[PDB]
Design a protein around this nucleic acid. Sequence first.
DNA 1: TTCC
Length: 664
Amino acid sequence: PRRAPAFPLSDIKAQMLFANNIKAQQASKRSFKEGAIETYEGLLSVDPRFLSFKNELSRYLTDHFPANVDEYGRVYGNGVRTNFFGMRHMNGFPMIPATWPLASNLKKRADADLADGPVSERDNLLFRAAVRLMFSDLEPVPLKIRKGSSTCIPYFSNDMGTKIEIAERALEKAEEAGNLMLQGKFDDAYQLHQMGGAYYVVYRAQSTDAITLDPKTGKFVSKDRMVADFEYAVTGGEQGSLFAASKDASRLKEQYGIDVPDGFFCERRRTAMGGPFALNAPIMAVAQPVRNKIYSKYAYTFHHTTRLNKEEKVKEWSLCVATDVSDHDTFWPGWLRDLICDELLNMGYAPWWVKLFETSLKLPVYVGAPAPEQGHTLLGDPSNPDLEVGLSSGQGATDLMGTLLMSITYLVMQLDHTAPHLNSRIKDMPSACRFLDSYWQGHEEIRQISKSDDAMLGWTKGRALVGGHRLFEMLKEGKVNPSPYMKISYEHGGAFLGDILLYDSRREPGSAIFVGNINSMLNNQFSPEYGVQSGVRDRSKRKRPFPGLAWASMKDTYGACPIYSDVLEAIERCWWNAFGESYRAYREDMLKRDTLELSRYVASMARQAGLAELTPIDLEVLADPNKLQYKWTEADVSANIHEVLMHGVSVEKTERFLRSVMPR
DNA sequence: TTCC
Ligand SMILES: Nc1nc2c(ncn2[C@@H]2O[C@H](COP(=O)(O)OP(=O)(O)OP(=O)(O)O)[C@@H](O)[C@H]2O)c(=O)[nH]1
Ligand SMILES: Nc1nc2c(ncn2[C@@H]2O[C@H](COP(=O)(O)OP(=O)(O)OP(=O)(O)O)[C@@H](O)[C@H]2O)c(=O)[nH]1
Ligand SMILES: [Mg+2]
Ligand SMILES: [Mg+2]
Ligand SMILES: [Mn+2]
């Protein structure tokens, strides 16, 4: 049923994805690589003392703090939703092999029994209403750019200077490029404006995955992660094969002579896509304004910040269901892409821009090196973009696409199983927009708070509430998928945006509170996703600019956790056994050092002014700028701090571009 | 060296 066209790096189609410069060329050639990460300055993830520490701490915590999650996934008690064996990984060493990204997910979706388009006219209206509400009255904003991020295909530059030029150029010729694409002249578009080509596969680490201890064997067991081989990938599942990547770390001994203590495994590898910047720029220029709108006007269901911010909304519900979507990104329906594009045209968006947007969502992917002796293959023909990979992470709006899909999906899941008496309110676009608008503002007896696949569905006192309970029960029994669109189920240990929803004996939304996830504190502090890159001189360009700062926001971020104090003590203790030092002291010094260093980057900061002026969010973002791409928004961060991490383009240049794009 |  149509196998995807594939080309070797030697092929001219692949060659053209990389500019005639060192960086680009190395990216294309880059072979498989692995190695211990520098968890903290001067400390390797595989250091014996460290692993030892990790072994004792994980075991002890898991033993003294077993999970407290009821038959309904509600977490009560100690707030622990699972064991602590997640830290038992050799950070820096991936499972082998990584997956080959699927060129088409149509079959994957069908076999999963998911619809190939809106199933009812209502649903069709709702999705289209979602588009109208989201992309309507948008205000221009400067186009911010992450510092030290790669522009990827074709240049692979990191120079903010070059990035800015690249972007500004894009906004100027985006229009001419799009028209080119409307004429089906993709190659011209790519050659003249670098808008097209492919996504460059980058492999992010999931430093902590499921690991269990078999009471029978006394042996540890790492959760299997299925991965598709090249055949499977190019045939959408028709041929080839799916299988568990190997997480066994024994190899480390024989290969690198690294001592591997029993019960430690290789890291899980998530695949990510680096989009061609010339293309994502014009998209990001619209995406941000869309973000601002829904985070403002529809803040009830979309703008979340503090544990209490969340708490307020959820407390007023009679029922709160914590949903969960499996492999959201690879399942994301191509039809939604096309629907959104069609509706945007209707709303009056420039055809060329919509074409750009559409193309960005069906572009080919260049696979680097999923494993030793593997990779360097371009999937899909750049000349005529026709892939269906679902959401492509590096695209300029993957969060909006995910939200647009899941928010409506959840609303529908509610209508379908709990509120048919509302169906009559949705008869046409107008009535639909009106309903959806009211709904997103939290003004109906059914509600939701969400971000892509993570969400909490609520029910106030009313007709729908008895239905909610049946739904939740359907989810518990889990034998029937409540949606025709994605595969939904309840989250075991319900949590939202990193905060666990803590129930008491009542087991009701009103007598509940949001607390940080304790395991996440552990994950972050001992299993970071990247090392400290002490080699990169510019800290603002590192994946972890100021690691030591996280200590300052810790009490704030996790203090509320039921076993906070206990864990800190357990750590302090085990760290002592392992290093003969105070962990507290260690982090305290790191803290002082980084606070001093930070001032060298923050203007307004006296060349030694404390963290007095900084907020907890500021600190967490400075230690992990990644969180700025999912947990928080530019608006939730101190202006002077956001400047350290991001750099923008003239509000004028974007404002002018945005004007030629929007309808009104 | 390698995404939002
Ligand atoms: N641009 C980008 N978005 C990411 C990245 N990682 C997670 N996301 C966001 O998170 C969503 C995917 O949710 P995850 O929980 O990470 O994974 P999943 O594919 O849904 O499935 P699980 O593996 O079962 O959790 C997407 O909608 C993205 O917007 C990443 O590296 N880059
Ligand atoms: N957009 C984005 N989201 C990320 C990224 N890393 C973690 N996340 C968020 O975290 C989710 C699962 O990714 P994990 O890395 O397992 O999460 P974690 O914060 O380490 O901890 P858990 O909540 O216990 O899974 C995603 O659904 C994202 O929303 C990242 O690089 N980009
Ligand atoms: Mg998920
Ligand atoms: Mg997840
Ligand atoms: Mn959740």
